[PDB]
Amino acid sequence: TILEGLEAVRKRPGMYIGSTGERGLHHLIWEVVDNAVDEAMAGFATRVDVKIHADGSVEVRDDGRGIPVEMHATGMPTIDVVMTQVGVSVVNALSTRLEATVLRDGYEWFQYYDRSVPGKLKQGGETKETGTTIRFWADPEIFETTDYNFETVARRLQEMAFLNKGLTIELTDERDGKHRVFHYPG
Amino acid sequence: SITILEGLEAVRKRPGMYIGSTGERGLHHLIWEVVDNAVDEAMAGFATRVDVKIHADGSVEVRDDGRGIPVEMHATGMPTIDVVMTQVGVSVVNALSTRLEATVLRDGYEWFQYYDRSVPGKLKQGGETKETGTTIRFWADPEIFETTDYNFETVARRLQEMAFLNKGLTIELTDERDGKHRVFHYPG
Numbered sequence: 001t002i003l004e005g006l007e008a009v010r011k012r013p014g015m016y017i018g019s020t021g022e023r024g025l026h027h028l029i030w031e032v033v034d035n036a037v038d039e040a041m042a043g044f045a046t047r048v049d050v051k052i053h054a055d056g057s058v059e060v061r062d063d064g065r066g067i068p069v070e071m072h073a074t075g076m077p078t079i080d081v082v083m084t085q086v087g088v089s090v091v092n093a094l095s096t097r098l099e100a101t102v103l104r105d106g107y108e109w110f111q112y113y114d115r116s117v118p119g120k121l122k123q124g125g126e127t128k129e130t131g132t133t134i135r136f137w138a139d140p141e142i143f144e145t146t147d148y149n150f151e152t153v154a155r156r157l158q159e160m161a162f163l164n165k166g167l168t169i170e171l172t173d174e175r176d177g178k179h180r181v182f183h184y185p186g
Numbered sequence: 187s188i189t190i191l192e193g194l195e196a197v198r199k200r201p202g203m204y205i206g207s208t209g210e211r212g213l214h215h216l217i218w219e220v221v222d223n224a225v226d227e228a229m230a231g232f233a234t235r236v237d238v239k240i241h242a243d244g245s246v247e248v249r250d251d252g253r254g255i256p257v258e259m260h261a262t263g264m265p266t267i268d269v270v271m272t273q274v275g276v277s278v279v280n281a282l283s284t285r286l287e288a289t290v291l292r293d294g295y296e297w298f299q300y301y302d303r304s305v306p307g308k309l310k311q312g313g314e315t316k317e318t319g320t321t322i323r324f325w326a327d328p329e330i331f332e333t334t335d336y337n338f339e340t341v342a343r344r345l346q347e348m349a350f351l352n353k354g355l356t357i358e359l360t361d362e363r364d365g366k367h368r369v370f371h372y373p374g
């Protein structure tokens with residue numbers, strides 16, 4: 001049933017991200033970034049870092065509270081409930097791979113998803129830091145393009161910074177070295 | 187299999203036999219081993235660039251554009267990359283790390299592997315690419331080392347020396363803890 005839900009996304013992605021061209025591809029970034037910016041609005045995060053990797057993956061890191069990793073009532077870690085059932089599960093469904101690294105509850109935690117199928121959540125080292133890193137690889141079977149446009153992403157992140165005064169958003173493109181930092185005082 | 191585990195446990199039992207000591211000098215030996223493997227690939231004529239990143243979580247990432255660690259099934263019934271990470275020089279880094287991740291571009295694909303206290307995960311085949319190279323990210327074990335705090339200046343001075351001794355190689359160093367950076371490239 002959880003698998004059927006994610007397969008429904010792959011069958012009709014337009015129902016979830018509007019379309020499967022360049023605008024649909026960029027929706028994967030908007031979803032993950034919106035989740036990070038939500039932590040800034042909530043008063044926990046101060047910075048969101050976005051990287052476009054040369055392998056076509058995108059990495060989004062925040063210093064918010066960290067996606068909860070404790071066991072959920074449904075019998076999987078809460079992070080796995082999130083990545084299989086809520087908004088960002090669409091990103092998992094339409095990615096060949098998603099990795100999550102969370103700083104929370106005194107530890108670094110590692111999870112991966114292989115075509116949306118969770119690995120086993122691993123507890124890493126001790127840390128007082130909190131936050132979330134998500135890295136995802138858009139599925140080229142789904143999208144008409146896997147080419148992210150730096151200028152499109154930069155203009156969106158600059159507007160997000162303008163609506164969320166005091167938030168810093170950094171964007172790095174590892175394909176060609178482009179780098180921008182956006183922030184408005186607040 | 188018993189022998190492979192015995193070998194890694196021998197390293198944890200007496201790390202001084204393999205990296206000299208378990209203070210700061212010993213800690214920095216983990217970076218030298220991984221970087222040495224990348225620089226050797228470059229100067230054997232297969233790579234042009236080595237990128238070293240000290241992450242805010244205390245992990246170190248070393249990336250090269252060399253041939254990539256071989257990933258094909260080995261005669262022993264595990265992938266060659268798992269033989270490498272459990273048996274050769276870099277297996278000392280794996281043994282003295284709580285975690286090691288390898289991302290290899292080779293044989294037409296991006297490949298993902300992890301090691302939890304040197305125990306391999308299942309090697310995963312990712313997307314298609316002609317590109318080749320190796321990325322290793324490792325988390326030094328604080329139960330082994332007296333300190334896990336790498337020194338930017340120590341790393342920079344050693345990488346500068348490596349670039350000087352290997353003319354034509356680019357070595358880039360970034361430290362996400364405090365934003366420090368260097369790029370070394372001696373023409374040759």
Ligand SMILES: CO[C@@H]1[C@@H](OC(N)=O)[C@@H](O)[C@H](Oc2ccc3c(O)c(NC(=O)c4ccc(O)c(CC=C(C)C)c4)c(=O)oc3c2C)OC1(C)C
Nearest residue numbers: 034035036038039062064065066067068078082086088132
């Ligand atoms: C993709 O996850 C997103 C988050 O994205 C990021 N990047 O943080 C963020 O947008 C937002 O994050 C929330 C949203 C609400 C709470 C929240 O209400 C918390 N309060 C708790 O006491 C708490 C503790 C454990 C727990 O399982 C839950 C409910 C489960 C949630 C929020 C998934 C809540 C908390 O600690 O963290 C929260 C966090 C991190 O919602 C998620 C989890 C869907």
Ligand code: NA
Nearest residue numbers: 015016017018
């Ligand atoms: Na949507």
Ligand code: NA
Nearest residue numbers: 031034087088
């Ligand atoms: Na959403």
Ligand code: NA
Nearest residue numbers: 063064130131
């Ligand atoms: Na935080």
Ligand code: NA
Nearest residue numbers: 099112287300
């Ligand atoms: Na990883």
Ligand code: NA
Nearest residue numbers: 251252318319
């Ligand atoms: Na290469």
